[PDB]
Amino acid sequence: AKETFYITTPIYYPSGNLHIGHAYSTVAGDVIARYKRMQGYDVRYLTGTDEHGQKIQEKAQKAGKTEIEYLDEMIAGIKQLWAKLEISNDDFIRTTEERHKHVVEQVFERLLKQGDIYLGEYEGWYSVPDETYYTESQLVDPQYENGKIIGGKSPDSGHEVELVKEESYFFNISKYTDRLLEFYDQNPDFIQPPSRKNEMINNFIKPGLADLAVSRTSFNWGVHVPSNPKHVVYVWIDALVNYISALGYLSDDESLFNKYWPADIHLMAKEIVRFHSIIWPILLMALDLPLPKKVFAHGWILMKDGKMSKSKGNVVDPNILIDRYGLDATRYYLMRELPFGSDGVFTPEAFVERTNFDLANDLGNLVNRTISMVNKYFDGELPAYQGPLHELDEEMEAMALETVKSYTESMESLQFSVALSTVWKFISRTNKYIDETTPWVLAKDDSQKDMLGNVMAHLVENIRYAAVLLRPFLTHAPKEIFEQLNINNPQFMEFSSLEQYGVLTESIMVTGQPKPIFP
Ligand SMILES: COc1cc(C)c(Oc2cc(NCc3nc4ccccc4[nH]3)nc(N3CCN(C(C)=O)CC3)n2)cc1OC
Ligand SMILES: Nc1ncnc2c1ncn2[C@@H]1O[C@H](COP(=O)(O)OP(=O)(O)OP(=O)(O)O)[C@@H](O)[C@H]1O
Ligand SMILES: [Mg+2]
Numbered sequence: 001a002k003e004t005f006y007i008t009t010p011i012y013y014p015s016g017n018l019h020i021g022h023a024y025s026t027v028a029g030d031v032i033a034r035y036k037r038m039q040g041y042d043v044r045y046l047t048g049t050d051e052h053g054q055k056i057q058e059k060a061q062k063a064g065k066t067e068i069e070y071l072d073e074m075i076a077g078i079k080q081l082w083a084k085l086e087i088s089n090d091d092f093i094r095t096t097e098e099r100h101k102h103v104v105e106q107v108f109e110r111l112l113k114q115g116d117i118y119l120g121e122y123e124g125w126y127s128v129p130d131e132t133y134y135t136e137s138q139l140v141d142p143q144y145e146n147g148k149i150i151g152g153k154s155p156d157s158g159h160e161v162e163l164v165k166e167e168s169y170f171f172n173i174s175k176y177t178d179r180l181l182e183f184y185d186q187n188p189d190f191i192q193p194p195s196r197k198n199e200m201i202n203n204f205i206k207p208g209l210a211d212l213a214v215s216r217t218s219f220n221w222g223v224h225v226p227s228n229p230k231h232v233v234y235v236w237i238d239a240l241v242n243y244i245s246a247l248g249y250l251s252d253d254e255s256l257f258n259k260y261w262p263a264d265i266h267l268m269a270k271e272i273v274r275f276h277s278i279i280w281p282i283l284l285m286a287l288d289l290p291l292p293k294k295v296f297a298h299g300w301i302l303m304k305d306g307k308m309s310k311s312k313g314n315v316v317d318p319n320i321l322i323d324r325y326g327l328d329a330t331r332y333y334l335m336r337e338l339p340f341g342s343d344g345v346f347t348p349e350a351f352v353e354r355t356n357f358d359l360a361n362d363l364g365n366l367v368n369r370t371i372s373m374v375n376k377y378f379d380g381e382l383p384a385y386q387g388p389l390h391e392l393d394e395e396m397e398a399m400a401l402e403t404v405k406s407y408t409e410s411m412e413s414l415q416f417s418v419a420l421s422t423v424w425k426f427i428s429r430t431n432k433y434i435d436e437t438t439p440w441v442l443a444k445d446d447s448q449k450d451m452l453g454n455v456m457a458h459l460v461e462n463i464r465y466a467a468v469l470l471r472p473f474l475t476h477a478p479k480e481i482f483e484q485l486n487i488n489n490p491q492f493m494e495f496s497s498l499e500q501y502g503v504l505t506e507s508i509m510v511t512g513q514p515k516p517i518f519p
C-alpha cells in the first residue's frame, strides 16, 4: 500500500478573526499535503480550532451569545476561509466535538490513575493587558515582603500583575526528562529548523521542567474532569490531543489512528514549538504512544510594529486579498515571498509586484503568446513532439530535467520559495526561447514549417512542466493551462510524466479562444 503521510496545522483560537498569519500555516500545510499526494503518499491533512477557556466565555458574553453560538459562527467563518483558499484538509477538528472531549477525559483520567497527575495549587501572576500569566521568576521590578515575592509587573507590557492561586492538577513532566533527551539524540531532525531545539534544551529543559498545571477551577467552559468535575482541563492536554482525537483515538473506530499516527509533520510558528517539542512528546510517553516524526516551525509574518496579531491592531484579512487579487495570487505570495526559516514583513506593494510580475506577466504572457502562435501558424493544431530539432533544444530539455530535480530537492527540504524561484527561472527561460527562436521569421519560410512546429512543441512542453510543478501551489492556474492547451490525459498532469521530456506524441487542437490565466 501507499505509505501514509500525516500532517497537521495548529488548532487556532477563535477569540477573533483569523488573518494572513493563520492562512500562511494552513497554505503551507496544504502545499505539503498536495505535493505528498502527487508523490504517491496516502495523505491525511488536519486543521481545526481550540475552543475552550475563559476568553471564549468572555467573547460570547460580550456578544450576547452562548459559547457555542459564538463559536459556531466563528468556525463557519474559518471553514469558509479554508474553502475560499481551496485547502485540501481531510478533516477539521473542533475541541467542542465529543470525539475530542472523550479523549481529553480519558487521557486525564488515565494519567490520574497512573499517578502522573496529582492535586495541588497553581500559583501564577496575571496581567490583564497581556492575557498572560507569568511565574514569579520572570516578573520585572519584583516586589518583596520578607519572603517575597509578593508582586511585580510584566516583562512584556509593564503592567501590574495580580496574584492568582487556585486548586489545580499537576502533571509531573520532569520524570520524562531523560527519555526526552534520549529521543532528541535518536531523532536529530525532530525539531526544524535546528535553531529551535537548542533554545528548548537551554532555556527550558536544563533548569529544568516544573510540574505542569493541567487543570483549573476558575472557569467552566471546557472539559470537566470526570472524577473531579469542579476541575476543568486547561490548554495543555485539551489542545494538544486534537492530533489524535481527530483520528478517532479511544472511539469505537480507531482505524484512522491506527493508520496515520504518528504524525509525520506538525507545522506551526515559533511561539508554540516548546509546547509541541517538550509537553506533547512527554504526554505521548505517559500514554505509551509513538512520538511525532517532526515539529516544523516556520517564521512570522510581520508588519512595521512587528508580528501580525489581533491585539496589535495590525492584521491583514486573507479574504480581502483573495477578493481583490485572486486565489492563486494570494497563495503564491504567501509561499514565494517569505519564507519558512525567516520572518518577513508584509507590504501591499510587495504583494502586487510579486503577483503582477511573476503570475500575470511572466507565466500568463508565456501561455498566451504560445497559444496565439499555434492558432496563427498552425490553425490551432499543435504538432507532436519529435525531438530536440533546434540548436537550443538539447540544453533547454536538460534545463527542464534539472528544474524538476532542483525543485524536488527544495520541496523535500521545505524550501518552498526556492522551489518557486526555480520554476520561475524555467518559465522566464521559456519566454526567452520565443525571443531567441523568432518564430515569426520561421513562419515566412515554407521549408521551416517542421522547425516552427518543433519550437511550438517545446514551448508547450515547457509550459506543461511548469504547470505540473505548480500543482501543489496554485489550484487554479495549472488546471486552466491544461484546459487551454487541451491536454486531457490525466497522466500528463502528474510528476511521473516529467521523467522524459517530450510526452506529447499526437497532434492537439489547442483552444481557439485563449483567455488570461490570471487572476
Ligand atoms: C495544537 O495547537 C496548539 C496547542 C497549544 C498548547 C497552543 O498553545 C496555546 C493555546 C492557547 N489557547 C487558549 C486556550 N485557553 C484554554 C483553556 C482551556 C482549554 C483550552 C484552552 N485554549 N493558550 C495558550 N497559552 C495560554 C496562556 N499562557 C500563558 C503563559 O499565559 C500559556 C499559553 N497556549 C496553541 C496551539 O495552536 C495555536
Ligand atoms: N504572524 C504570524 N506569522 C506566522 N504564523 C502565524 C502568525 N500568527 C498566527 N500564526 C499561526 O497561528 C498559530 C498561533 O498564533 P499565535 O500564538 O500568535 O496566536 P493568535 O491566534 O495570534 O492569538 P494571540 O492573540 O494570542 O496572539 C501560529 O503558531 C501559526 O501557526
Ligand atoms: Mg505509515
Ligand SMILES: [Mg+2]
Binding pocket: 308, 309, 310
Ligand atoms: Mg498572535
